[PDB]
Amino acid sequence: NLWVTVYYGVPVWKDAETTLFCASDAKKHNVWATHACVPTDPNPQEMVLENVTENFNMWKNDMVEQMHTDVISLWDQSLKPCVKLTPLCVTLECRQVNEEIKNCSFNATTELRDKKQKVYALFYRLDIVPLEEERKGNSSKYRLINCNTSACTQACPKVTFDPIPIHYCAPAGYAILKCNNKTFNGTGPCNNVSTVQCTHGIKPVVSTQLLLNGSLAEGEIIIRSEQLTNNVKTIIVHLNESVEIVCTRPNQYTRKSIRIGPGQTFYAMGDIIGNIRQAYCNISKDDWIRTLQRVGKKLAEHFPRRIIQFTSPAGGDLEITTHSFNCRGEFFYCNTSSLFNSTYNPNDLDITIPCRIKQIINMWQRVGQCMYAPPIEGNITCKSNITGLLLVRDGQETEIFRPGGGDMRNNWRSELYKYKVVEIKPLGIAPTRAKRRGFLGAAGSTMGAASITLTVQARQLVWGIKQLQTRVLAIERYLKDQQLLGIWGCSGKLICTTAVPWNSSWSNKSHDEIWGNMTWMQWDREIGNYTNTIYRLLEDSQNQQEQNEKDL
Amino acid sequence: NLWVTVYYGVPVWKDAETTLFCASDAKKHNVWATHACVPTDPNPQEMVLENVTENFNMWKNDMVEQMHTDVISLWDQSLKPCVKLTPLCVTLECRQVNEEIKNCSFNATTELRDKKQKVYALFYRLDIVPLEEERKGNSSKYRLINCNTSACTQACPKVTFDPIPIHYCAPAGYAILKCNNKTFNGTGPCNNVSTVQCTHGIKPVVSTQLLLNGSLAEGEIIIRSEQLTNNVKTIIVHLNESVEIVCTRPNQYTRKSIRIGPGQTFYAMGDIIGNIRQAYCNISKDDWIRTLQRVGKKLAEHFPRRIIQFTSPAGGDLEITTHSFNCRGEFFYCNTSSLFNSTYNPNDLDITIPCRIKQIINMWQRVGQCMYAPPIEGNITCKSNITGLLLVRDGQETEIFRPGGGDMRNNWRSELYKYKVVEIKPLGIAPTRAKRRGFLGAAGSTMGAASITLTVQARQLVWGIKQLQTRVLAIERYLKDQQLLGIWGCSGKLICTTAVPWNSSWSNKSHDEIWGNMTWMQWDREIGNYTNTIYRLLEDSQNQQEQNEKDL
Amino acid sequence: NLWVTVYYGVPVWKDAETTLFCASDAKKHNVWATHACVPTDPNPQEMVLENVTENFNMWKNDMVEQMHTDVISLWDQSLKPCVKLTPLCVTLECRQVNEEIKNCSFNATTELRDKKQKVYALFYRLDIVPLEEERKGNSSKYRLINCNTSACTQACPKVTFDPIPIHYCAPAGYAILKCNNKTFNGTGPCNNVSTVQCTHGIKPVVSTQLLLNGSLAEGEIIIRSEQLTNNVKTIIVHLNESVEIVCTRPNQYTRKSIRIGPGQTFYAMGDIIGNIRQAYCNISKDDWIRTLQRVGKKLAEHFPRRIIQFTSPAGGDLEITTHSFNCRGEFFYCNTSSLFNSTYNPNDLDITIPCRIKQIINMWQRVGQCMYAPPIEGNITCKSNITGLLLVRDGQETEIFRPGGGDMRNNWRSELYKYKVVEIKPLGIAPTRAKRRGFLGAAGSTMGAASITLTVQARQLVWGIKQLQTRVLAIERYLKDQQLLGIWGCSGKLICTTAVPWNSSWSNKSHDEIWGNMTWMQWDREIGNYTNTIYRLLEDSQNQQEQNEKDL
Numbered sequence A, B, C: 001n002l003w004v005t006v007y008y009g010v011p012v013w014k015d016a017e018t019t020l021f022c023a024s025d026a027k028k029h030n031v032w033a034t035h036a037c038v039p040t041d042p043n044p045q046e047m048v049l050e051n052v053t054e055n056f057n058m059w060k061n062d063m064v065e066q067m068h069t070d071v072i073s074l075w076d077q078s079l080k081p082c083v084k085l086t087p088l089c090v091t092l093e094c095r096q097v098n099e100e101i102k103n104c105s106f107n108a109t110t111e112l113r114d115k116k117q118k119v120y121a122l123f124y125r126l127d128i129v130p131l132e133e134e135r136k137g138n139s140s141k142y143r144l145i146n147c148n149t150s151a152c153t154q155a156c157p158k159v160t161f162d163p164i165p166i167h168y169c170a171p172a173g174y175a176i177l178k179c180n181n182k183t184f185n186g187t188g189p190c191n192n193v194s195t196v197q198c199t200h201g202i203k204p205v206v207s208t209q210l211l212l213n214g215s216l217a218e219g220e221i222i223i224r225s226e227q228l229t230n231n232v233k234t235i236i237v238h239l240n241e242s243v244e245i246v247c248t249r250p251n252q253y254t255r256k257s258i259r260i261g262p263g264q265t266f267y268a269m270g271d272i273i274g275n276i277r278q279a280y281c282n283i284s285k286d287d288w289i290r291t292l293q294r295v296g297k298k299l300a301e302h303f304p305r306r307i308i309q310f311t312s313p314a315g316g317d318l319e320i321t322t323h324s325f326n327c328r329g330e331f332f333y334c335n336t337s338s339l340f341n342s343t344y345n346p347n348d349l350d351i352t353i354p355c356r357i358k359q360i361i362n363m364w365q366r367v368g369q370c371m372y373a374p375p376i377e378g379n380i381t382c383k384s385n386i387t388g389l390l391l392v393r394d395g396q397e398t399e400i401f402r403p404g405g406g407d408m409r410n411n412w413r414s415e416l417y418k419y420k421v422v423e424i425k426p427l428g429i430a431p432t433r434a435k436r437r438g439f440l441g442a443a444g445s446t447m448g449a450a451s452i453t454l455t456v457q458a459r460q461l462v463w464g465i466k467q468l469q470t471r472v473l474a475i476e477r478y479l480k481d482q483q484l485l486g487i488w489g490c491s492g493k494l495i496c497t498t499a500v501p502w503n504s505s506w507s508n509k510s511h512d513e514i515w516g517n518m519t520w521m522q523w524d525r526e527i528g529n530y531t532n533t534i535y536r537l538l539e540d541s542q543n544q545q546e547q548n549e550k551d552l
C-alpha cells in the first residue's frame, strides 16, 4: 500500500496575471526614465528547463497591458509638474513667413495679470486651425489645435526623450519563461524554454508603421498574427537584418522665451536662419527592396497562389496615415507611400521620404491630453535600425497589405513575444511507500529526480501601491501555504508523509512508474481534478485525531 | 491535578473598530458605483450561533462612519474629473420667463481667452441671489448661489445617480454578527444572532425626513432612538409595510451646450415647451393616514398618558425644512407640512405635495463643495417605497414630533441596525488532565463540544491604502499569534499542553464542569482578568528550560 | 568536538538606513502638528547597554534627512488646501505711509469675474520690487516679490506655527541607540550607550545663526563639526547654559479682508495705530559677553596659537545675512552684526538688535514655493532660549568665525547628535558541545550570559505608504528568518543544534573561552567573513538528508 505524501517546492506552475517590478541599469531624469523601481540584477541567472514544451500565446500576454500602463504613467509623471500653456488658445494673426510655417502674432498674457504683450511665434501649418477665411497673400485669423478640446501641456525643458531599457524581473512567487526557439511565431508550443529572473531590456520606442531599434530574428523573416485569415488583426513582420534609416530636419531655429505667467515660460520657435528646407528621412534603396522582396516571399508562403502588392495606407488623418517618428523630442510625420510601392510576383542611391513636423501632438491616441513640444536647437539628426514592419491585410488573386499602426501595444508585442509570466504552485501531492540549480530548473525531470530542488525552489517567497499590493499578496500566499501545512501537521518540514492511504482512483499508476517516468507537470495535470478532495481528506481529520489521541 | 492547555481557534471575540472591504454584484460607471472593491460572494454562508445573546447598540457602530466616509469618497471621485464651472459666477441680467424660473442672460467666457459671448440660460429662483433691487416687471442683476463661497462642480454627464447595493464583507480576522430578532430596537440583547461573510446590500439612497427604498419590519412598527426621554436625539421609525410615493416634474426642457473653455462645456436649461407646471409628488391618502395612526399608537405606547401631534418642521432654511429627494439627478425639495398634519388621540384619492427643484445643491451639509446638476431631458418620473420616518421630539399633555433630517448617517443606521463588527481572538487557555460548520458557528456550545471547529475557525487568517492597511494588520496579528505559540513551544499544532499547573485561583471550577457546562465566551470572560499573568507564566520559562535541558 | 548551534534573538546589530514612525504626545491642527502618526509611549523604557562602545557619527545620520523630509511634508500639507493668491501679482501704486511700509494701492479681482475693485494694503518695502523709477515724494509702480517666479500661497488663518515635539520611535526590527556621554562631540566612540523605544522630543524650530529652544550641554561648551581644518563645514556650538532672547514688534496693525475670488480671501495689513516703531529683539549684554568669551576660549583650545575674532556675516542677500526668527507666524530678519563683534585674546543693560519683518518668505531655500504670512494682530512678543550657535570658519595668526545658516538640516543635527539607528540581526551561529530586561539589553555581556534575552529580544517582530513599506519590509524580513530556520529543521525553537561539525578555521577559540569571555558583537565580527559559507553548509544538506532517511 501507498500513503499520501505532501511535497513543498514542487516545480509546477499555472498561467497567471500579475503586476511586475520593473528594473533599469544604474544611472535618470529623462522621459521614460525609471525612477520608480529597483536597479537590475547584473546576471539574470537564465536556466534552461529541459524536456519542457510550454504553449506560448503572445497576443494574450498581460505584460503588454502592464507595459502600456507603465509607459503612460511615466509619460504623465514627466509632463505633469511643468507648464500647462493655458495663456495660449488665443486668436492668432498669421502671415506668410519671409506654406508650412506661419508668422502667427498673438497677445497671450504677461507675468502680471494687468498687462498683455504683443508677441509672435512661428507655428507649423499643421498646428494652427483657420478661422474666418484664409487669404493667401494676407494675414488671417487662426487658433491653435486642441483649443476646442484641451489646453496642451508644454514638454518640460529639463527632461529629454530617451527610450531607456526597462527590465521586468518576475515578482516573488512568479517566474518568467523565455522562449528561445528560432523561427517561432506568436502562438504555439516552444521547445526551448528557459526561466529568467529578468527579461532583456525593452526600449519604449514610439513609432508607427515601422518598428525601430527593436530585436531582430536570428533565423528568417517571421510573420506574427493572431490569425492571417482574419483581416482585422495586425501582422507584425520581423526581419533577420536591420535597415538603416537616417531622419533629418535640415534647418536651424532660435528658441524664444515668452513669459506668460509667474514662473511658467512658453518656448517659441523663431528667427529662421537661411532657407526653409523640407524635413526628410533616407532609407537605403537596395536594402529596402531586398527586404520587401523577402517579406513578399514569406507572406506568399503564408498566402499561397496569390500576388502580394504593397500600395499605400488606406487613408485617414495625418496621425494614422503617416509614419510617426520621435527625433530628440521633435515629432516627425513622414509620408511612407513611396516606400510601400511594389508587387511581389510568386513566379519572379537612397530613397528620400518627405516628412512634416508637428509641435502639438496627441500621443497614445488619447483625447484631451495633448502635449506641445518646444523647438530643439541643434543639428537634429537621428539614425535608427528598422527591425520590423506593421502590416494590415485588406479584406481574389491579389492580396493588399497596407501600413498600419495607431495602437502602440503592438510594438511592444514585437519585443515581449518571447516571454510568459507563470505562477508557481509549490505544493504538490504524491503517493509514497511510507505511511508516516535554481528557480524552476527541475521541470521536465522525473518526480524522483526532482527531490533536491524542493528546498531551493520557493526561496523566492500609483506604482508605489501596486508594488505593495504585489508584495503583500506574495506574503499572503506564502502564509496560506504555511498555515495549510501546519493544519496537516507538516509545518517545519519540506516533505511530510501522512496516514491517509492512496486507494487508487486518483491515479491508477504504480509507485515505481510514477516516480520513474512521470514529471511533476504531468502528475499535477492528472491530479488537478482531485486536488481539492485530496486536501479535504488530509485536512483536519488526521491532525485532529493525532492531537486528541496524544493529549488523551 | 490539571495543567494549562493552549487552544488556537477558540470561538471567542471582542468588540472592535475596523475598516471593511466593500463588495457589489457583478457589473458600473454611475455615481456610487463600486469600482473600488471586489465582487460579492453569491452565497453569504450565514450560520446561526445558538445559545448566544450578543448585546447590540446600533448608535455606536463604526460601520455607519465607515459608510459615510465611503459614500463621500465615491461622490467626490465621481465629480472630481469633470467641469468646475469657474467661468460662471458672473453678473446675470434676469428677466421674467415668457416667478420660479428667470431668463438670466450672462456673458461667461468662450473657448478662446480673447472673446466673450452673450449667452442665456434658465435658472431656478432658488439658485440666483439678487443684487441691487429686484424689479418685478424688469430685468434685475443676480449672481449664482455659492459664488461667495465656492464655485460649483458640474455633475459629469457621463454618469448618473443610482444607489447600487454595497455589501461590506467582514475582513479577515473579523466577523459580522447579524441580529435576526424581530421587534428589536436599536439597543439591547439579541437572542437570534448569526455570523455572515457579507451583509445584505445597503443602498446609498439620499433623502431627508422620509426613508426611501429601505428595509421594512416583518413584525410591527419599531421606534429606534438612543433615548426617548432626551429630546436632542433623532427617532427612526420603521414601518412593517411600505407606502408608495410617486414624484414628477411635469414639464419639458431642452439642454443647451455653452462652451466656456477648452473641452469643458456648461449644460444650460432652456426652450421650455408648453406651460410651466409646478413639480409635485403624490402619496396615497389612505395608506399615509393609516401609517401615521399606527405610528401614533406605537409612540403613545412609548409615551403613555400623552396626546401625540404631528405639526410641521420647526423652521430653518430650505435644505432642512423640506424633504430632499433625488429623481434621476434632479434634486427636489418637497414641502411636507401638509403630510404631518394630524393628532393621535389615545382614546380614539392621493395627497399632492408641492415641490420645488434646485440645480445647485450643497450635499452632505458641507460648505464649499457645491455641485450643479444639469437639466435632465425626459419624462422625469420616480416611484419609490417609503419605509420609515425621521422624527424629532420637541423639548405637558401633548408631545410634538416634527420631521427631521440633515445628518445622512441616520438614514444608514436604518439599514445597519442589525449588524455588529467583532474581532476574533482565536487564542484561548483552559486546564486539562494532561501535563505535556464554519466561521464562528460553535459559540454558545460547551468547551468540550467546541473541539472540531478549532481548525475550521482561523482559516480566514484613499481606499487602496486603507485596504492595504487592513490586510497588513491582519497579517501582523496572525504572525504575532504564531510567534507567541512558537515561543511557548506550540507552533505547528492547534492544541498544545504545557508543564505549568493550574493551581486554582484563576478559576475555582473543576475540569468536568468546565468542559461540561461552560462556553468559551463565559470562560474567556472569567479568565479575562488573568490572561496576561497566565501568558507570562507560560512564556519563556518553560520553553527555555526544555530547550536548555535538551541541549545539555 | 563541537557542532554548529543556531541561536535566534542574538543581541547583535548592523548600521542601517530606514524610515521611522514618528509620535507625539496626545492632543493638534497647527503647523507641524503630527496628525500623520501614533501617540507616544509614556515610558520610553530606556535601558543602558553595559560594556558597549558604539561609534557614533552624527554627520552621516539618516535621521536628519528623514526629519527634513517629514518637516517639508507637514509644511506643505499645512499650506496646500488654502488660498493661492493668484489674483495678486498685479501692478501696485505705492505711496509713502502717513520707508519700510508703503501704501501700495491695487485692483486685484472681486468675487465675481466681471468686476474689479480698487483696494489697498500695506506692504513692507522688502516684499515690493520697484518698476519704472522710484520717486521719493510720489507714487511709484511696484510688483510683489516672487511674481516673476511663483505666486505665493497664503498661510491659512485656521492654523498657527508651533514647534510641537516629534518622537521618532524605532520601527520594529530596528532600535535607536542613544549616547549619554557628556562632553561628547559629533563623531567618535560613546562609552555610555542605551537603547530606547523613542527619542526625546525634537522641536522643529526654524531659525538661522542662533539655535533656539534646543537642548543644552550638562558639561561644558561643545564644538561639533565634521572637521575643523576644513573651512567649508558648519560648526555647531552647544552652550551649557541658555541666554534669554526677547523679540518684539512694538506696533499694532488691523487685519483687513479683501475678497479676491469665490471663498478665497486675502488678508491685508492696514490702519496703523500710532507711530511706526522698528521691530527689535533684546539679548542680555552680560550673558552674551560671557557666552562668547567662553566659546572663544574653547575654540582657542581647538585652534591653538591663534586669536579668535567674531566680525560679521560674510555678505549676501537678506535671507542668509540676517537671523531668521519666527514669532507667532511673523517672520523677523534681525541684523546680528552688532552681536558678533568681539575678539578673544588667548592671553586675556541689554543689547538691542534692530530687526526687519517680511510677509512673503521663501522657506527652506526652495524656489517657486513662496508663502505669504498674514499680519497677526496682538502684542507679538516672543521669548526664547538661545542654546547654540552656527559658526563658519573663513579660509595666519587670526581665525575668522562668521555667523552661518541657510541649510536647516544642521539645526536638527543639534538635537539628533545623540541618536543612531541600527538594524537588529537576531540570527547568530556558535559552536556548542551537543551534536543534535528588554530590547537589546544584553549586548556587551558574554555569549553564555546572553541566554535569557534570546526570547525577549525579537518580540518586536506620502507618509501612509512609507509607513506601510516599513511594516511590510519588517514582516518580510521576519518571514525570511522563519523560512530559513524551517529549511534548517529549526523552526518552532529559539535554540537548535545541528549535525554540522565546527572543525576550527572559522574560529580558533575553544568552547569555554568563547562562551566565557566573548560577547555576541565580537563573535559576529569575527564570524562575519564566514557566515554565508556556514549557512550554505548547514542549509539543505542536513535537512534533506534527515527527511529522506526518516521517510525511507
Ligand SMILES: *[C@@H]1O[C@H](CO)[C@@H](O[C@@H]2O[C@H](CO)[C@@H](O[C@@H]3O[C@H](CO[C@H]4O[C@H](CO)[C@@H](O)[C@H](O)[C@@H]4O)[C@@H](O)[C@H](O[C@H]4O[C@H](CO)[C@@H](O)[C@H](O)[C@@H]4O[C@H]4O[C@H](CO)[C@@H](O)[C@H](O)[C@@H]4O)[C@@H]3O)[C@H](O)[C@H]2NC(C)=O)[C@H](O)[C@H]1NC(C)=O
Pocket: A157, A158, A159, A160, A161, A162, A163, A205, A206, A207, A212, A213, A325, A326, A327, A328, A329, A376, A381, A382, A383, A384, A385
Ligand atoms: C534609435 O537609437 C539611436 C541611438 O541611440 C537613437 O539616436 C540617438 O538619440 C539620442 C537621443 O535620444 C542622441 O543623443 C544626443 O546626441 C547629441 C549629439 O551627441 C554628439 O556628441 C556626443 C558627445 O559624447 C557624441 O558621443 C555623439 O556621438 C555626437 O557626436 C547630443 O548633443 C545630445 O545631448 C542632449 O541630450 C543629453 C542627454 O543627457 C543632454 O545631457 C545634453 O545636454 C543634450 O540635451 C539638450 O537637448 C535636450 C532635448 O533633447 C534638452 O532637454 C536639454 O536641455 C539640452 O538642450 C544627445 O546626447 C544620439 O546622438 C542619437 N544617436 C544617433 C546615432 O542618432 C534613435 O533616436 C533611436 N530611435 C528612436 C526612434 O528613438
Ligand SMILES: *[C@@H]1O[C@H](CO)[C@@H](O[C@@H]2O[C@H](CO)[C@@H](O[C@@H]3O[C@H](CO[C@H]4O[C@H](CO)[C@@H](O)[C@H](O)[C@@H]4O)[C@@H](O)[C@H](O[C@H]4O[C@H](CO)[C@@H](O)[C@H](O)[C@@H]4O[C@H]4O[C@H](CO)[C@@H](O)[C@H](O)[C@@H]4O)[C@@H]3O)[C@H](O)[C@H]2NC(C)=O)[C@H](O)[C@H]1NC(C)=O
Pocket: B157, B158, B159, B160, B161, B162, B163, B205, B206, B207, B212, B213, B325, B326, B327, B328, B329, B376, B381, B382, B383, B384, B385
Ligand atoms: C427607489 O427605487 C426606484 C426603482 O429603482 C427608483 O426609480 C428608478 O430610478 C432609475 C434611475 O435611478 C430609473 O431608471 C431609468 O429609467 C428610465 C426609463 O426606463 C424605461 O425603459 C426601460 C427599458 O428597459 C424600462 O425597463 C423602464 O421600466 C422604463 O419603461 C430610463 O430611460 C433611464 O435610462 C437612463 O439611465 C440608464 C442607466 O444606464 C442609461 O443607460 C440611459 O442611457 C439613461 O441615461 C440618461 O440619463 C442619464 C442621467 O440619469 C444621463 O447621464 C445619460 O447620459 C442619459 O442621458 C433609467 O434606466 C428607473 O426607471 C426608476 N424606476 C421607477 C419605477 O421609478 C427610485 O428613484 C428610488 N428612489 C430614490 C430616492 O432613489
Ligand SMILES: *[C@@H]1O[C@H](CO)[C@@H](O[C@@H]2O[C@H](CO)[C@@H](O[C@@H]3O[C@H](CO[C@H]4O[C@H](CO)[C@@H](O)[C@H](O)[C@@H]4O)[C@@H](O)[C@H](O[C@H]4O[C@H](CO)[C@@H](O)[C@H](O)[C@@H]4O[C@H]4O[C@H](CO)[C@@H](O)[C@H](O)[C@@H]4O)[C@@H]3O)[C@H](O)[C@H]2NC(C)=O)[C@H](O)[C@H]1NC(C)=O
Pocket: C157, C158, C159, C160, C161, C162, C163, C205, C206, C207, C212, C213, C325, C326, C327, C328, C329, C376, C381, C382, C383, C384, C385
Ligand atoms: C521658544 O519657546 C517659547 C515658549 O513656548 C515660544 O514662545 C511662545 O510661543 C507661543 C506660540 O508659538 C505663544 O503662545 C501664544 O501666547 C499668546 C499669549 O498667551 C497669553 O495668555 C495665555 C492664557 O493661557 C497665558 O498662558 C500666556 O502666558 C499669555 O499670558 C496667546 O494669545 C496665543 O494664542 C494663539 O494661539 C493659540 C494656540 O491654539 C490659539 O488657540 C489662540 O486662539 C491664538 O490664536 C490666534 O493666533 C493664531 C496665529 O498664531 C491665529 O491662527 C488664530 O486664528 C488666532 O488669531 C498663543 O497661545 C507663547 O505665549 C509664547 N511664550 C513666550 C514665553 O514667549 C517661542 O516662540 C519659541 N521660539 C521659537 C523660535 O519658536
Ligand SMILES: *[C@@H]1O[C@H](CO)[C@@H](O[C@@H]2O[C@H](CO)[C@@H](O)[C@H](O)[C@H]2NC(C)=O)[C@H](O)[C@H]1NC(C)=O
Pocket: C046, C047, C048, C180, C181, C182, C192, C193, C194
Ligand atoms: C549612562 O546613561 C544613563 C541613561 O541616560 C544615565 O542616567 C542614569 O544615571 C544614574 C546615575 O546614578 C543611574 O543610576 C541610572 O541607572 C541611569 N539611567 C539608566 C536608565 O540607567 C547614566 O548616568 C549614564 N552614565 C554615565 C557614566 O554617563
Ligand SMILES: *[C@@H]1O[C@H](CO)[C@@H](O)[C@H](O)[C@H]1NC(C)=O
Pocket: A181, A182, A183, A184, A188, A189, A190, A191, A192
Ligand atoms: C520551434 O518551433 C517549431 C514549430 O513548428 C518547431 O518545428 C521547431 O522544431 C522548434 N525548434 C526546436 C529547436 O525544436
Ligand SMILES: *[C@@H]1O[C@H](CO)[C@@H](O)[C@H](O)[C@H]1NC(C)=O
Pocket: A050, A051, A442, A443, A444, A445, A446
Ligand atoms: C530530459 O530528457 C532526457 C531524455 O533522454 C534525459 O536524458 C534527461 O535527463 C532529462 N532531463 C530533465 C531535466 O528532464
Ligand SMILES: *[C@@H]1O[C@H](CO)[C@@H](O)[C@H](O)[C@H]1NC(C)=O
Pocket: A500, A501, A502, A503, A504, A505, A506, A537
Ligand atoms: C478511493 O477510490 C474511490 C473510488 O471512486 C475514490 O472516490 C476515493 O476518493 C479514493 N480514496 C483515496 C484515499 O484515494
Ligand SMILES: *[C@@H]1O[C@H](CO)[C@@H](O)[C@H](O)[C@H]1NC(C)=O
Pocket: B181, B182, B183, B184, B188, B189, B190, B191, B192
Ligand atoms: C427579541 O428581543 C426582545 C427584547 O425584549 C425579546 O423580548 C424577544 O423575546 C426577542 N426575540 C426572541 C425570538 O427571543
Ligand SMILES: *[C@@H]1O[C@H](CO)[C@@H](O)[C@H](O)[C@H]1NC(C)=O
Pocket: B321, B322, B335, B336, B337, B338
Ligand atoms: C408649505 O406650504 C404651506 C402652505 O401654507 C406654508 O405655510 C409653509 O410655510 C410651506 N413650507 C415650506 C417649507 O415651503
Ligand SMILES: *[C@@H]1O[C@H](CO)[C@@H](O)[C@H](O)[C@H]1NC(C)=O
Pocket: B050, B051, B442, B443, B444, B445, B446
Ligand atoms: C444550545 O443549547 C441547547 C439547550 O438544550 C443544547 O441542546 C444545544 O446543543 C446547544 N447548542 C449549542 C451549539 O450551543
Ligand SMILES: *[C@@H]1O[C@H](CO)[C@@H](O)[C@H](O)[C@H]1NC(C)=O
Pocket: B500, B501, B502, B503, B504, B505, B506, B537
Ligand atoms: C495559584 O494561586 C495563586 C493564589 O493567588 C495565584 O496567585 C497564582 O497565580 C496561581 N497559579 C497558577 C499557576 O494558577
Ligand SMILES: *[C@@H]1O[C@H](CO)[C@@H](O)[C@H](O)[C@H]1NC(C)=O
Pocket: C181, C182, C183, C184, C188, C189, C190, C191, C192
Ligand atoms: C566620553 O567620550 C570621551 C571621548 O574622548 C571620553 O574621553 C570620555 O571618557 C567619555 N565618557 C565616559 C563617561 O566614558
Ligand SMILES: *[C@@H]1O[C@H](CO)[C@@H](O)[C@H](O)[C@H]1NC(C)=O
Pocket: C050, C051, C442, C443, C444, C445, C446
Ligand atoms: C560588564 O563588564 C563588567 C566587568 O567587570 C562585568 O562585571 C559585568 O557583568 C558586565 N555586564 C554586561 C551586561 O556585559
Ligand SMILES: *[C@@H]1O[C@H](CO)[C@@H](O)[C@H](O)[C@H]1NC(C)=O
Pocket: C500, C501, C502, C503, C504, C505, C506, C537
Ligand atoms: C574546516 O576547515 C577548513 C579549512 O579552511 C574550512 O575551509 C572549512 O570550512 C572548515 N569547516 C567547518 C565545518 O568549519
